[PDB]
């Protein structure tokens, strides 16, 4: 049942491992540029210094967060949960 | 459970020009212009082909080196009767039908010449695109004795042809196992290629010159930690998730990695310091 | 049987003549080989 | 005896392999092997004989050969040289096949029409049509009669359709037919010989095998019994024939065989007697009782032997 | 449950077999290997390498379609992983 | 050089949607995947891919008709998809 399937996942799929991904920034760069690039080259990204990094799972937008050096151990601290309207606005760009 | 579905382009025109060459050959051989109508290429299991095969008939084994296995060509008793009486010059408007009776020596010999003529026609037609030598092996009267395929359910591709000489008509088929064309599965699907002379090569290089200024976006990843949707649901904004030390940054476009890099603080920007471009050729050379 | 011995001597002379006839047959086989083949065909036809 | 074939054979066994090879290549396999056997085992050698053989060869050389250049032996090679010098078309080879084809057509006319038919029934009906057209009209009519009705009608219809009169394909068609009789003649079918062999056997074993083959195949057994049949009914045997045989056959032998034979056989045999002979035979049949069945069968076998002798003479059709 | 709308990755398998690397050393590029699950057994249905359920593939609508038949059944999951 | 038994893995295609559309369908619901009829399958070892090959049935048991070791080229495309 549709309701049964929705109800099942809250308990049956409650215990299930998943994956995630995080992105730093985006820059326009073409094959001429990559061929010209060499060892030790530095490339910047549109992500401003200190900007929280977007957090996604299997390529699906989830949230945004920033890494913090706690106990000399890096850890991303999320700051928001993307709303459907803000997600629509983000993809409408 | 054996199901295969595919479409081909080159073999259609190959069969068409082969049929035109065969029509020319029969015209000059029998002093009378024939007409060959190529039927829609048949793809069926070997047992289905054997069932559809009109018994009695003559089956012929023609090996195709260097590809493993032997090819098959079949002809109808009506076709061989009509061809041989045209060789005799008889009208054949009062024909006889032979069933179960094995072909006489003269009939099998006329079969031999027409078989070698068909072999030569198909050889020139095929070598016009891809040079694959064809060598006859052994004629057969019953399909079960041909036993080319491993199993009767093995899918065999067949090209039917409808050949007529004036009022007299006929049909013969050229059938081949799918395993025979398995090595050239890509070459059969695509239509043949025009040109391919030195200019075409440089034109392809010129295409790369135009493609030099392409449009692509790179993706940078830091951590891919396996967690649970239970944790995600109980996760709230402000929560921090520890991350192992990212000794390098992997760069990929549409999924495929291209290089590795190190993050750096340059001019107040999320800058990455590349180490080396990750090339498949470089990885193969290293391995 | 002195006459029989003379007949045997005549037979030996006939044998020498037969060897000469065989040599003549060999000569016919030897010279004009074409003509020998033609005579072969002619004898086959007469057969 | 020394026939023209035998004279050439003696010539060959006298001369040697130098001309024997050419004779073989211009000759046929059975005569090649006959001369090989003659070389293997020879007892026809004499001082005068060999010289006479050389003289006969000289006669053949001056007459049959007429001291001419190799006849189609080395000439065919120069003919091929001219053919090669002229257009690239082996017409001479086609003419060679035509030569065998025409000879085979003549042979076809000579040989048995029904055997020709069954050798050509399997072949193409157009082959039958064209070969029948090219054959003699009488031989063609014989093969036409020996054909079944439907095949015969198809052959004549395709004869009517036959207008291509083709050109070297026809020659090799006859060559294939000749090769299908080129194989050892055999002809050991002996459709009559089974019957003949059973007749040669004892009469009781003959009847036993007749019953056995009746069980095997009533058709084949009935054919064998027909082959046994020899002057059993007047109408098929012909009275004129009963008249002619039985005056040649001894009257006493006929009497002894008849008193052991069936009364219908006695009546049909006596109907061709001179009336005095018939009356004498019947009176003696009444007088003497049935003599030993061995002697009765001996007289019957003598009657059959005289029937076979007159069949050898061939003046009339026995039964 | 705002995270309800999340694309999941599923994994469908046929069967397993404990083969040593030497076996694969001799197994050619066109070799045949059997499994442990008998033919006709419902193929195990998993997601991201995690056991879920089982199902059988059937040729319907000109495509290979697996038919979900069993539920996650955590007790049966415990029993299965106890192997 | 040293030998050891190892776990293999065969995968019949991968789709792209939430499991909810799948779990809403109760038991006995037939669902298809990107795995169609005709394409050869893939073999993984401990989750690490090796080769491609169709699988047939023999002696009431599955038999894989493996073809050739998967190269990193098409490994990249199958990782992307």
UniProtKB/TrEMBL annotation, chain B:
Its main location: membrane. FliM is one of three proteins (FliG, FliN, FliM) that forms the rotor-mounted switch complex (C ring), located at the base of the basal body. This complex interacts with the CheY and CheZ chemotaxis proteins, in addition to contacting components of the motor that determine the direction of flagellar rotation. PANTHER family: FLAGELLAR MOTOR SWITCH PROTEIN FLIM. Transmembrane segments: none annotated. This is Flagellar motor switch protein FliM. Residues 210-278 form the Flagellar motor switch protein FliN-like C-terminal domain. It is a peripheral membrane protein. Belongs to the FliM family. It is found in: Cell inner membrane; Bacterial flagellum basal body. One of its GO terms (cellular component) is bacterial-type flagellum basal body. Keywords: Bacterial flagellum, Cell inner membrane, Cell membrane, Cell projection, Chemotaxis, Cilium, Flagellar rotation, Flagellum, Membrane. Coiled coil: none annotated. InterPro entries: CheC-like_sf, Flag_FliM, FliN-like_C, SpoA-like_sf. GO terms for molecular function: cytoskeletal motor activity. One of its GO terms (biological process) is positive chemotaxis.
């Amino acid at each position: 049942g549709d309701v049964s399937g929705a109800m099942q996942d809250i308990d049956l799929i409650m215990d299930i491992p998943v994956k995630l991904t995080v992105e730093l920034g985006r820059t326009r760069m073409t094959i001429k540029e990559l061929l010209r690039l060499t060892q030790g080259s530095v490339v910047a990204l549109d992500g401003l210094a200190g900007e929280p990094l977007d957090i996604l799972i299997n390529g699906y937008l989830i949230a945004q967060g920033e890494v913090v050096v706690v106990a000399d151990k890096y850890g991303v601290r999320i700051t928001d949960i993307i709303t459907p309207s803000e997600r629509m606005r983000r993809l409408s760009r | 459970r054996r199901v295969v579905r595919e479409r081909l382009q080159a073999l259609e025109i190959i069969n068409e020009r082969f049929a035109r060459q065969f029509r020319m050959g029969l015209f000059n051989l029998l002093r009378r212009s024939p007409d060959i109508t190529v039927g829609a290429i048949r793809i069926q299991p070997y047992h289905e082909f054997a069932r559809n095969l009109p018994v009695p008939t003559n089956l012929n084994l023609i090996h195709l080196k260097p590809l493993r296995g032997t090819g098959l060509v079949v002809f109808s008793p009506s076709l061989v009767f009509i061809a041989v009486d045209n060789l005799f010059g008889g009208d054949g408007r009062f024909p006889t039908k032979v069933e179960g009776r094995e072909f006489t020596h003269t009939e099998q010999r006329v079969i031999n010449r027409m078989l070698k003529l068909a072999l030569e026609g198909y050889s020139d037609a095929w070598k016009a695109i891809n040079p694959l030598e064809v060598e006859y092996v052994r004629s057969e009267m019953q399909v079960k004795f041909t036993n080319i395929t491993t199993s009767p359910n093995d899918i065999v591709v067949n090209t039917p042809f409808h050949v007529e000489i004036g009022n007299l008509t006929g049909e013969f088929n050229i059938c081949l196992p799918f395993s025979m064309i398995e090595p050239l599965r890509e070459l059969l699907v695509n239509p043949p290629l025009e040109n391919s002379r030195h200019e075409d090569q440089n034109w392809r290089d010129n295409l790369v010159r135009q493609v030099q200024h392409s449009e692509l976006e790179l993706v940078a990843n830091f951590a891919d930690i396996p967690l649970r949707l239970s944790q995600i649901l109980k996760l709230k904004p402000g929560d921090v998730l520890p991350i192992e030390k990212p000794d390098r940054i992997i760069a990929h476009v549409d999924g495929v990695p291209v290089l590795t890099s190190q993050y750096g603080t340059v001019n107040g920007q999320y800058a990455l310091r590349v180490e080396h471009l990750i090339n498949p050729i470089l990885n193969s050379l290293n391995e | 049987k002195d006459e029989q011995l003379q007949q045997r001597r005549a037979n030996q002379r006939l044998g020498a003549e037969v060897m000469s006839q065989r040599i003549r047959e060999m000569s016919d086989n030897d010279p004009r080989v074409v003509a020998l083949v033609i005579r072969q065909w002619m004898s086959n036809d007469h057969e | 005896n020394l026939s023209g074939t035998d004279k050439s054979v003696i010539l060959l066994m006298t001369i040697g392999e130098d001309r024997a090879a050419e004779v073989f290549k211009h000759l046929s396999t059975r005569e090649v092997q006959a001369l090989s056997t003659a070389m293997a085992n020879v007892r026809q050698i004499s001082n005068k004989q060999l010289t006479d053989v050389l003289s006969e060869f000289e006669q053949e050389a001056e007459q049959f050969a007429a001291l001419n250049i190799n006849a189609n032996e080395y000439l065919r090679s120069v003919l091929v040289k001219a053919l090669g010098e002229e257009r690239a078309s082996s017409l001479l080879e086609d003419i060679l096949e035509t030569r065998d084809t025409t000879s085979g057509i003549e042979t076809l006319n000579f040989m048995e029409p029904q055997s020709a038919a069954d050798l050509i029934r399997d072949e193409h009906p157009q082959i039958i049509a064209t070969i029948l057209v090219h054959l003699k009209r009488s031989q063609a009519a014989d093969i036409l009669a020996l054909f079944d009705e439907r095949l015969r009608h198809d052959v004549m219809l395709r004869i009517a359709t036959f207008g291509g009169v083709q050109l070297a394909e026809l020659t090799e068609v006859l060559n294939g037919l000749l090769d299908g009789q080129n194989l050892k003649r055999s002809k050991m079918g002996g459709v009559r010989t089974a019957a003949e062999i059973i007749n040669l056997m004892k009469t009781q074993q003959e009847e036993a095998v007749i019953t056995a083959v009746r069980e095997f195949d009533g058709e084949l057994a009935q054919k064998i019994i027909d082959e046994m049949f020899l002057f059993e009914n007047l109408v098929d045997v012909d009275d004129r024939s009963i008249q002619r045989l039985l005056q040649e056959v001894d009257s006493e032998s006929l009497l002894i065989a008849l008193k052991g034979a069936e009364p219908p056989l006695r009546e049909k045999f006596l109907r061709n007697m001179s009336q005095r002979a018939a009356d004498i035979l019947r009176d003696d049949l009444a007088n003497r009782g049935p003599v030993r069945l061995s002697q009765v069968e001996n007289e019957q076998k003598a009657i059959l032997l005289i029937v076979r002798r007159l069949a050898e003479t061939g003046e009339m059709v026995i039964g």
